[PDB]
Design a protein around this ligand. Structure first.
Ligand code: ZN
Ligand code: ZN
Lengths: 97, 712, 398
């Protein structure tokens, strides 16, 4: 009873819900300010190819921890290099265990 | 932990355009477990539990419809077959008699029969179908039939033999007595399928009813009908509920085609099998324990029946996890338990947990328990001889690791091909990534926050890890995979075993395969002499010293630990201590004139006779310090006086060893050996004079007849 | 009798060092061994023995101390390299004129690079004052990330650890150096302070390792502000992006500037961004023609009109020539203005403070409007009111 309450009080989002706020913004923002672009004879859609969807970019005041930050983007770099899972696959853990 | 299929029998005789099908509904199990039952459309099947083969041919034509339920009588002597022919048959059963099974008493309701149950004590039968429920007593042979308002689906008699519980698909749960009166009624909104009564237990001694409703819940009900408030939720709709003997486990099946195991509290442990179809009935093998019987009883047996028509048997074996650091041995008992045993007084201390323990690691006066999504640490009051355990800290963080270790102010977890360093608070601190799976890890002592460790990989390369370095140090390379590693007392050598049960000894200063051995199960190093190595094969344990022939014992067991004049041998899950005589290595060291190492070996607790022998040998070979130590460790007065005389006369006089050898022999009762040794070189007259003081002038005269007096 | 603690106490009482060393090793209490190495007078074989024991235990600091007290230096370097203690190795090599350490470090870094561990190589280079190679490695990692989903705040986090780890290592070295200093060190630090007072902007720019972090933060802030109205702040943020022009390529900065300028009707900046975009280094003919078509359409719908704004008085210098609010270049004066990481507005007021983790200027009014409990860039969890008071005290000192 106290365990659940304390965990909910702190609840450090480790991996699973770091920034999970994914909602279609290619259509949400295009309704916000694109109207006078379509109204006039202006084609700036090529320039907008730079802009990243904003819902993924989270905007809240949180606390950043050096150790935590280290762990997070170490996991990100290991993922983006894609080397752990390959050697895990050629490790054949399931065949042995 | 490991679940293995045993034998599968399939029934493919599907009959289209006929109400008889190939499905199997129930599977009754005998109390002894030597026979097994199953029911199929228009037939019954008798099986042997250990090996899958029909002891008796399938019986057909007895019931013109399907068979809904088959049950035993808790004594292995009766059969009860309920059929959609609106009839229940009761058969007599006996293995030795020429008719193994034969009908005894048959009765019929007004409508179809759906469920049946037996009385553990009085062996009364309660059969409930649509519109009716009936009670049968063997003595009177007069059935009592009563009407109801809806069809009962499930029944179960309490283990006390007093209460009865039935459920209806209309949501009504009824609890009655042996007189069939409305003791308690509970109304729900979902159908009732599976019900059971918790087994009687000396720790609990109270019976409650566990019922699985179809709204994804399992509920506990008291005798009066008041719910206990558990109302545990489930992802899937349950179908069958079975309680193991002594009320320790709970086998749950239903939707998702999986057979899972739970504790009586509700903690998930494992799943048994996924049959790709609904499992109508799963049963557990009863066990019988003798008066004071000793056995781990890790083995478990389950029987499953699927909707396709497969009656399968599965065997579950629990692996052993234990830890041994010093003066303590903490091993996992029957699941959700930790027992700490002391090797001296054989006393035990029990710690009970509710969730499954995955790893046990004990540091200096610190015990670490790795519960599912929980970490516990307990300390010890060192001043008191008996250990008192108190919980300083608890870790709520969920961590997955096949190997867990605890060091001073830190924790180490091995998962896949990665090593994670955890602070006691819970936050991750440091990461290590290796090429292959980390198989074995060994922790060596050191400063807090600076404890080193050894790591073995599936490739075989042996690495060293420091807490703060964050850079692995390659120790050596091995071609074959590593199963277990050990380090010497002075960190001079290292013994490593491969997957082929091959033992290899590597020198750290010079990486060279000095020693190789075949067919080795376990090995250990001494903690005091640094040189002795004790390795145990499947049947024989060998101890080996430096450049010495091996010594055999024919000791049954595996070597776990080696201490000063002590060897720990672990059989099954209990371990004992065996003392080893150090006289052989003593003699071998005396052969090569290595008195320092011989004295070091003798210091390991050898008998005083060997101490006296070593003192004599050292005194003869002009080593006075070791001689004094040996003659002092055992309280002796004449020998130390003779040693003082020898050390005083060594500098000045000749110090002929013959005289002192004769005096050593004459200090015992062996006078003739001393006389022979004294006559050997040339000391006749002094032998004469030493024999005279014993007042045996006659034998001294016989001696002085031969000896001369070269003076003047 | 295998009772080591009592034997150690008796040996200490009897002034016998070999048994003391043996007992301390057996009990695994090397603090008594530190007391012994402080107590052993000079130049003995026991020095080498205890150095061996320390190297086996993994404490190469004490091992190197014992080796240097004994009179052997090569063994200290061997311990430092074997245990991968590279900071002490670099210090010892520099002080005692050892040259092969750089080659060995290069080979080990190349081995780690082949082992696909660029972050570990960056750590190694940061341990040995080689932060430039770590900077190039981090830039390569960011470029590789951009090829994928590439949530920008992940790159911001990476540059933030780079800066924070550099600061932590420098602080550790600094604290080691200042602790127990002499008159010569005091004079050197006084000269360093004198040079610190009269510092140059370029030296500060090179020193600060937060360049990529603040660049990505400004990019994210510009995008976020542009999405939620506030075009005038997005302009200033994009102008800061244009000022940096180092980690972010020209394409991104100029596209953002053009979009913001068009949305704010400020067409001089849009024209500058478009003439920049027509040829950065290389572009296919179709893309360049499309960009020219967009430019000619935009600028032939109506001529570029400059919107009026407030020409606030300049605070950088005494010149009466006012500078535009968006402009940060401060032409003909050379006094560039420090950024505000809150919203991007340049510091045009006395109210500016900074933390002791990222030292970035910050306006009180922006914090009050936004109610920011933490620093916008480094998320320093310290109260902003006390920090404003501390900065006011520091300014009063100046
Ligand atoms: Zn100016
Ligand atoms: Zn800051």
């Amino acid at each position: 009873a106290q365990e659940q309450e304390v965990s909910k009080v702190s609840a450090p989002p480790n991996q699973p819900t770091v920034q999970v706020q994914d909602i279609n913004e290619l259509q949400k923002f295009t309704k916000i300010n694109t109207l006078p672009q379509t109204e006039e004879g202006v084609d700036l859609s090529q320039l907008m190819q730079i802009l990243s969807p904003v819902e993924d970019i989270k905007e809240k005041d949180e606390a950043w921890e050096f150790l935590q930050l280290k762990t997070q983007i170490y996991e990100i770099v290991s993922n983006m290099y894609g080397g752990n899972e390959l050697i895990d696959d050629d490790d054949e853990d399931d065949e042995n265990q | 932990m490991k679940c293995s299929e045993l034998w599968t029998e399939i029934i493919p005789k599907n009959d289209p355009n006929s109400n008889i099908t190939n499905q199997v509904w129930s599977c009754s199990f005998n109390n002894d477990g030597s026979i097994l039952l199953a029911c199929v459309g228009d037939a019954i099947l008798v099986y042997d539990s250990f090996t899958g083969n029909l002891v008796n041919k399938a019986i057909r034509g007895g019931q013109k419809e399907q068979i809904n339920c088959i049950k035993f009588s808790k004594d292995g002597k009766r059969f009860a077959t309920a059929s959609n022919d609106k009839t229940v048959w009761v058969w007599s059963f006996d293995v030795n008699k020429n008719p193994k099974l034969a009908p005894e008493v048959k009765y019929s309701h007004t409508d179809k029969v759906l469920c049946l149950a037996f009385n553990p004590l009085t062996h009364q039968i309660f059969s409930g179908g649509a519109q009716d429920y009936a009670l049968w007593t063997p003595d009177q042979q007069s059935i009592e039939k009563s009407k109801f308002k809806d069809k009962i689906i499930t029944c179960a008699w309490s283990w006390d033999g007093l209460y009865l519980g039935f459920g209806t698909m209309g949501g009504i749960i009824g609890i009655r007595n042996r007189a069939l009166e409305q003791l308690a009624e509970i109304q729900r909104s979902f159908p009732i399928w599976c019900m059971d009564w918790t087994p009687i237990t000396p720790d609990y001694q109270n019976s409650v009813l566990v019922v699985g409703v179809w709204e994804q819940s399992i509920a506990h009900y008291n005798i009066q009908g008041q719910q206990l408030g558990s109302d545990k939720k489930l992802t899937y709709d349950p179908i069958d509920i079975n309680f193991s003997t002594q009320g320790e486990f709970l086998l749950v099946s239903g939707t998702n085609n999986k057979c899972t195991l739970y504790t009586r509290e509700g903690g998930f442990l494992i799943d048994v099998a996924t049959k790709n179809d609904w499992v109508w009935n799963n049963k557990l093998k009863p066990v019988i324990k003798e008066a004071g019987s000793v056995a781990v009883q890790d083995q478990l047996h389950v029987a499953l029946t699927t909707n396709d028509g497969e009656i399968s048997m599965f065997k579950i074996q629990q692996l052993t996890v234990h830890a041994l650091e010093g003066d303590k041995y903490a091993y996992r008992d029957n699941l959700t338990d930790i027992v700490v045993q002391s090797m001296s007084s054989n006393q035990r201390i029990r710690l009970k947990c509710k969730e499954l323990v995955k790893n046990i690691s004990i540091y200096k006066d610190k015990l670490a328990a790795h519960l599912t999504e929980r970490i516990l640490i307990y300390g010890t009051s060192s001043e008191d001889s008996q250990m008192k355990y108190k919980l300083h800290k608890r870790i709520v963080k969920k961590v997955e690791a096949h190997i867990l270790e605890i060091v001073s102010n830190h924790l180490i977890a091995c998962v896949k091909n990665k090593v994670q360093l955890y602070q006691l608070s819970g936050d991750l601190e440091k990461e290590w990534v290796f090429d292959s799976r980390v198989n074995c890890i060994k922790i060596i002592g050191g400063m807090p926050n600076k404890e080193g460790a050894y790591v073995g990989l599936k490739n075989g390369q042996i690495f060293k890890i420091f807490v703060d370095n964050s850079f692995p140090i390659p120790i050596l390379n091995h071609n074959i995979s590593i199963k277990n590693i050990d380090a010497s007392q002075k960190r001079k050598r290292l013994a490593v075993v491969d997957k082929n049960s091959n033992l290899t000894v590597y020198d750290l200063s010079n990486k060279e395969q000095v020693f190789q051995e075949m067919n080795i199960v376990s090995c250990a190093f001494n903690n005091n002499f640094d040189d002795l190595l004790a390795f145990s094969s499947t049947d024989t344990t060998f101890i080996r010293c430096s450049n010495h022939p091996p010594l055999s014992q024919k000791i049954s067991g595996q070597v776990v630990g080696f201490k000063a004049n002590k060897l720990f041998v672990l059989n099954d899950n209990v371990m004992s201590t065996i003392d080893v005589s150090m006289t052989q290595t003593m003699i071998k060291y005396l052969e090569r004139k290595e008195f320092q190492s011989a004295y070091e070996i003798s210091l390991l607790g050898v008998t005083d006779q060997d101490f006296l022998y070593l003192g004599n040998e050292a005194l003869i070979a002009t080593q006075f310090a070791i001689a004094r130590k040996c003659y002092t460790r055992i309280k002796k007065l004449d020998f130390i006086y003779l040693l003082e005389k020898a050390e005083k006369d060594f500098k000045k006089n000749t110090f002929v060893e013959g005289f002192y050898q004769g005096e050593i022999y004459a200090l015992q009762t062996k006078f003739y050996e001393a006389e022979n040794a004294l006559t050997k070189s040339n000391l006749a007259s002094q032998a004469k004079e030493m024999w005279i003081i014993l007042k045996e002038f006659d034998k001294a005269m016989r001696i002085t007849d031969t000896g001369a007096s070269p003076i003047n | 009798n295998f009772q080591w603690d009592k034997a150690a106490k008796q040996y200490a009482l009897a002034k016998y060092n070999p048994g003391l060393i043996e007992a301390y090793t057996r009990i695994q209490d090397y603090e008594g061994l530190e007391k012994l190495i402080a107590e052993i007078p000079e130049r003995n074989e026991l020095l080498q023995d205890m150095g061996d024991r320390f190297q086996q235990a993994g404490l190469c600091d004490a091992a190197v101390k014992c080796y240097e007290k004994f009179g052997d230096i090569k063994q200290a370097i061997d311990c430092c390299v074997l245990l991968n203690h590279w900071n002490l190795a670099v210090e010892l090599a520099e002080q005692y004129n050892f040259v092969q350490i750089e080659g060995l470090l290069v080979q080990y870094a190349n081995q780690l690079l082949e082992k696909r561990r660029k972050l570990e190589a960056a750590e190694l280079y940061r341990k040995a004052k080689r932060n430039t190679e770590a900077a190039k490695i981090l830039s390569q990692i960011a470029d590789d990330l951009t090829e994928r989903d590439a949530n920008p705040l992940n790159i911001k986090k990476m540059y933030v650890m780079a800066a924070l780890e550099v600061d932590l290592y420098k602080k550790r070295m600094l604290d080691a150096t200042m602790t127990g200093q002499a008159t010569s060190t005091a004079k050197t630090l006084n000269s360093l302070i004198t040079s610190t007072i009269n510092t140059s902007s370029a030296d500060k720019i090179l020193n600060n390792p937060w360049r990529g972090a603040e660049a990505w933060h400004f990019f994210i802030l510009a995008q976020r502000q542009l999405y939620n109205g506030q075009f005038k702040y997005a302009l200033k943020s994009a102008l800061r992006l244009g000022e940096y022009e180092l980690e972010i390529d020209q394409k991104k900065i100029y596209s953002l500037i053009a979009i913001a300028a068009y949305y704010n009707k400020s067409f001089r900046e849009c024209s500058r961004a478009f003439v920049k975009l027509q040829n950065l280094e290389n572009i296919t003919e179709d893309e360049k023609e499309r960009y020219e078509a967009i430019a000619v359409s935009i600028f032939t719908k109506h001529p570029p009109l400059d919107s009026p704004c407030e020409y606030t008085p300049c605070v950088g210098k005494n010149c009466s020539q006012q500078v535009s609010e968006y402009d940060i270049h401060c032409r003909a004066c050379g006094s560039n203005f420090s950024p505000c990481v809150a919203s991007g507005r340049p510091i045009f007021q006395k109210e500016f403070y900074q933390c002791k983790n990222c030292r970035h200027k910050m306006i009180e009014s922006e914090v009050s409007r936004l109610k920011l409990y933490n620093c916008a860039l480094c998320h320093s969890p310290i109260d902003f009111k006390r920090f404003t008071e501390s900065n006011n005290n520091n300014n009063n000192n100046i």
